[PDB]
UniProtKB/Swiss-Prot annotation, chain A:
Homododecamer. Interacts with the terminase large subunit; this interaction allows the packaging of viral DNA. Interacts (via C-terminus) with the head-to-tail adapter protein gp4; this interaction participates in the head completion. Interacts with the scaffolding protein; this interaction initiates procapsid assembly, thereby ensuring incorporation of only one portal ring per capsid. Interacts with the capsid protein. The chain holds residues 533 to 629 of 725 of the full protein. It is found in: Virion. This is Portal protein. It comes from Salmonella phage P22 (Bacteriophage P22). The gene is 1. Belongs to the p22likevirus portal protein family. Forms the portal vertex of the capsid. This portal plays critical roles in head assembly, genome packaging, neck/tail attachment, and genome ejection. Procapsid assembly may initiate with a nucleation complex composed of portal and scaffolding proteins. The portal protein multimerizes as a single ring-shaped homododecamer arranged around a central channel. Switches upon genome packaging from an asymmetrical conformation in the procapsid (PC-portal) to a symmetrical ring in the mature capsid (MV-portal). This change of conformation may serve as a signal for headful packaging. It comes from the Viruses.
From Swiss-Prot, chain B:
Belongs to the p22likevirus portal protein family. It comes from the Viruses. Homododecamer. Interacts with the terminase large subunit; this interaction allows the packaging of viral DNA. Interacts (via C-terminus) with the head-to-tail adapter protein gp4; this interaction participates in the head completion. Interacts with the scaffolding protein; this interaction initiates procapsid assembly, thereby ensuring incorporation of only one portal ring per capsid. Interacts with the capsid protein. Forms the portal vertex of the capsid. This portal plays critical roles in head assembly, genome packaging, neck/tail attachment, and genome ejection. Procapsid assembly may initiate with a nucleation complex composed of portal and scaffolding proteins. The portal protein multimerizes as a single ring-shaped homododecamer arranged around a central channel. Switches upon genome packaging from an asymmetrical conformation in the procapsid (PC-portal) to a symmetrical ring in the mature capsid (MV-portal). This change of conformation may serve as a signal for headful packaging. It comes from Salmonella phage P22. This is Portal protein. It is found in: Virion.
UniProtKB/Swiss-Prot annotation, chain D:
The chain holds residues 243 to 290 of 725 of the full protein. Homododecamer. Interacts with the terminase large subunit; this interaction allows the packaging of viral DNA. Interacts (via C-terminus) with the head-to-tail adapter protein gp4; this interaction participates in the head completion. Interacts with the scaffolding protein; this interaction initiates procapsid assembly, thereby ensuring incorporation of only one portal ring per capsid. Interacts with the capsid protein. Transmembrane segments: none annotated. This is Portal protein. It is found in: Virion. Belongs to the p22likevirus portal protein family. The lineage of its organism: Viruses, Duplodnaviria, Heunggongvirae, Uroviricota, Caudoviricetes. Forms the portal vertex of the capsid. This portal plays critical roles in head assembly, genome packaging, neck/tail attachment, and genome ejection. Procapsid assembly may initiate with a nucleation complex composed of portal and scaffolding proteins. The portal protein multimerizes as a single ring-shaped homododecamer arranged around a central channel. Switches upon genome packaging from an asymmetrical conformation in the procapsid (PC-portal) to a symmetrical ring in the mature capsid (MV-portal). This change of conformation may serve as a signal for headful packaging.
Amino acid sequence: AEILELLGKTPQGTPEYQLLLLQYFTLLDGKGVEMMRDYANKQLIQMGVKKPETPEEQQWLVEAQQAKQGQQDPAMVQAQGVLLQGQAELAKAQNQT
Amino acid sequence: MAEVVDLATGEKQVLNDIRGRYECYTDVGPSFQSMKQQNRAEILELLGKTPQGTPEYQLLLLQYFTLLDGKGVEMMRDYANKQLIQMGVKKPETPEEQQWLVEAQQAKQGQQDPAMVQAQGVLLQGQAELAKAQNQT
Amino acid sequence: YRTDMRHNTAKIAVNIAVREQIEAGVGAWRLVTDYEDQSPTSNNQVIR
Amino acid sequence: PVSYFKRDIKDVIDDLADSGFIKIAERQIKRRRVYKSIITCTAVLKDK
């Protein structure tokens, strides 16, 4: 309930969504609740805010989790090196001159 | 795989089960005919109080998933399931589910993200071509 | 507090008290302690 | 490991229970038991 109170009094902004997921997270057993609570969790950890209870949580998620922002931001630098390679190519142009 | 958890028990001979029992406190709430009844409504409650955002749609599919037999319900419940597993959230009951779906399922995001890298290699081949330009100089 | 305050005894002790508080102006209930071995709030003890 | 059982409830079985995963140790417990007796004004038909 303390979360429900927090909803409504908050805009459809970002902090809202977390509350939301938090809500599903708190729900007690069920066919319905389990699956969604499970998604809610997965989402939240991968949001990086959850900080896993670690019964397994980290493994399945934190992996591919850490993998993307890394991949991208880290791939962008791999290719950003090509942005300098472009500079290096211009340097080659200078060398050509 | 070399890890697992959450299995049930027989407790063979008559009248046995741990004395670490009471793990359930007693509250009250609307009377339901059965479990599937409660889960069904418990989702409806969840709808309406939620925006047309993403989490909404899952609930929705979840809803069709929970529906009980019919010409109508079966087909849609079946789609709902297919969708949900392919959403990757379902985690198949495995009566077959994975096979037909998880296949083509795993196939697309893979294909694309994996094809993008095959061609991303061409993004470096473009770099390699510029390198060729350097070699040409 | 929420644990050994769930049972029906806690809810009742109050309502009686209130019922009485309304009609006569007063009311009350007490707190006590003893041992539970199965499902104790804590220390093989509970409060009620 | 570490699971517990009513001495009272597992009488005739224990034998069958040991030839499955025997183990031992003992402890005292507040249980609570109920007994339905039948009664007429004249005498008692089923006791305890």
